[PDB]
Amino acid sequence: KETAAAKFERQHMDSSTSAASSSNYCNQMMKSRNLTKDRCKPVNTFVHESLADVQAVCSQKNVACKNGQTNCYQSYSTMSITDCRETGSSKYPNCAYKTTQANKHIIVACEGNPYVPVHFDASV
């Protein structure tokens, strides 16, 4: 099956664009990346940086995740991100989202060898 590291890339990486260019970015990406296949995922975040720079966060500042685990890390610098949040008109299979573009530090959980991101915890 798809590995946790591969799933993180599919759900949270968009190195092909520097930022969301329109209000329809989330509606198109949530569908294209197959995140609305079984149900409308309520919230998701896409990171507009090189995969290498995001993977490097696993060697930066260690912080506890929201749930208490201690394998989470916060990026030293801010990154270009896009937050997708389900709107009131969203109804499966026609999931709808609001696109919000911002520059924030990201916090990810890391696992494995190579030690890489497998979960997006938050943006601060």
Q: Which residues participate in catalysis according to the annotation?
A: 12, 119
41 is in an annotated binding site: yes
Residue 35: CA atoms inside 13 Å, Cβ hemisphere, count?
A: 27
Of the options 3.40.50.880, 3.10.129.10, 3.10.130.10, 3.40.50.170, the CATH number for the domain spanning 1-124: 3.10.130.10
Distance, CA of 1 to CA of 5 (rounded, Å): 12
> Domain ranges in the chain?
1-124
Resolution (angstroms) equals: 1.7
CA-based R_g, the chain, Å: 14
7 is in an annotated binding site: yes
Q: Tokens 């060898």 — which residue?
A: 113
With beta carbons less than 8 A apart as the criterion, state whether 61 and 121 touch: no
With beta carbons less than 8 A apart as the criterion, state whether 114 and 3 touch: no
43 is in an annotated binding site: yes
Q: Output the CA angle 91-29-38, nearest 5 degrees.
A: 45
How was it solved?
neutron
Check residue 60 and report its DSSP letter: S
Burial class (CB in 10 A: 0-12, 13-18, 19+), 71: middle
Residues pairing with 74 in the sheet: 61, 107
Distance, CA of 22 to CA of 75 (rounded, Å): 26
